[PDB]
Amino acid sequence: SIDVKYIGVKSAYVSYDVQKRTIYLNITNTLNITNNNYYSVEVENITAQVQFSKTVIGKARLNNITIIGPLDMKQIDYTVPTVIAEEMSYMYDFCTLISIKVHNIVLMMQVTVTTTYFGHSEQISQERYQYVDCG
Amino acid sequence: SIDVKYIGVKSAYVSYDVQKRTIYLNITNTLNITNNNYYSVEVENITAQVQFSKTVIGKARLNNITIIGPLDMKQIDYTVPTVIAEEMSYMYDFCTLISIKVHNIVLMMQVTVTTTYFGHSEQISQERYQYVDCG
Amino acid sequence: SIDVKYIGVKSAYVSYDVQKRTIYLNITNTLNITNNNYYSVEVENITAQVQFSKTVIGKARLNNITIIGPLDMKQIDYTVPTVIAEEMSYMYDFCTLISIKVHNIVLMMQVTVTTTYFGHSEQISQERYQYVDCG
């Protein structure tokens, strides 16, 4: 929700950082902070109802009948990697990768035939990544 | 929602950063901060109802009836990488990548046949990425 | 929700950091901080009802009836990696990776046929990653 911050080297509220081979003399330095946060987030107030069937069938006749709910047959992230060779050869090579399914992250939150949802859903990734270094 | 910031090297409210081989003399420095935040985000008030079926068939005759819910057969991120060779050969090479399915991040929130949703959904990614370095 | 911060090297409220071969003399330095946080997050008030079926069959006749609920037959992250060769050979090579299925992080929260949900769902990842280093 709030202040989802990525900071690569350094973070401060205040910084007086002094780096290499420097001379830093006779400084007078003062700081008078009021820093106040009244975070009232993600506050909720709910009256809810969820009803998948009401049925009245009285004096009826219902002879042949068939009923089926929601039907799911997805394929997701589906693969058939096929590598066919005869003289598959690797010789004297320095830095070599033969990579046929690789992931850093899979996040999945709600994967469903059905959902009813009255909430708050937050999904976050923060990262630094190198696949190869071989200098 | 609020303040989703990506910063490469440094972040500060105030900074007096002094770098390499510098001379920094006789400075007078004062600071009187008032910084207040009253974040009231993602606050909610809900009255809700969800229903999938109400039926009243009285005195009727239903001889041959068939009923089917929502039907899903999607293919998502589907692949058939086929490599066919004879004398597949790699020799003396320095930095070589054979990559057939590679993913950094896969984020999926709600993947569904049916959904009713009364909330707040957030999906965030913050990255620095290098696939190959071989200098 | 709040302050999902990724910091690579250093984090501070106030910093007076002095690095290599530097001289820091006769400094007068004061600090007067009032820093207050009143986090009132994720406060809730919920009244809810969930029902799957209500039925009244009176005087009815149900001779050949069939009923089926929600149906799931998904395939997710499904693979058939096939590598076929005759003289598969690796010789004198220095840094060789054969990778056929590799995952760093796999997070799945709710994978279901049906779900009703009245809460808060948060899924967070914070990382630094190198797949190969061989300089």
Author numbering:
A (entry chain B), B (entry chain A), C (entry chain C): 120 to 254
From the paper:
TMEM106B is a type II transmembrane protein of 274 residues that localizes to late endosomes and lysosomes. Here we used structure determination by cryogenic electron microscopy to show that residues 120–254 of the lysosomal type II transmembrane protein 106B (TMEM106B) also form amyloid filaments in human brains. The TMEM106B folds shared a similar five-layered ordered core comprising residues S120–G254 and contained 17 β-strands, each ranging between 3 and 15 residues. We observed three TMEM106B folds, with no clear relationships between folds and diseases.
In fold II, these internal cavities are smaller than in fold I. We observed two subtypes of fold II (IIa and IIb) that differed mainly by the conformation of segment A167–I187. In folds IIb and III, there is a large extra density at the end of the side chain of K178, suggesting that this residue may be post-translationally modified. Although we did not solve the structures of filaments comprising two protofilaments of folds II or III, the micrographs of case 19, the only individual for which we observed filaments with fold IIa/b, and the micrographs of case 21, with fold III, also contained wider filaments that probably comprised two TMEM106B protofilaments. Our best maps for filaments with folds I, II and III had resolutions of 2.6, 3.4 and 2.8 Å, and came from case 1 (sporadic Alzheimer’s disease), case 19 (MSA) and case 17 (MSA), respectively. We divide the sequence that forms the ordered cores of the folds into three regions according to their degree of structural conservation: the amino-terminal region (S120–T166) is conserved in all three folds; the C-terminal region (Y211–G254) is conserved only in folds I and II; and the middle region (A167–M210) varies between folds.
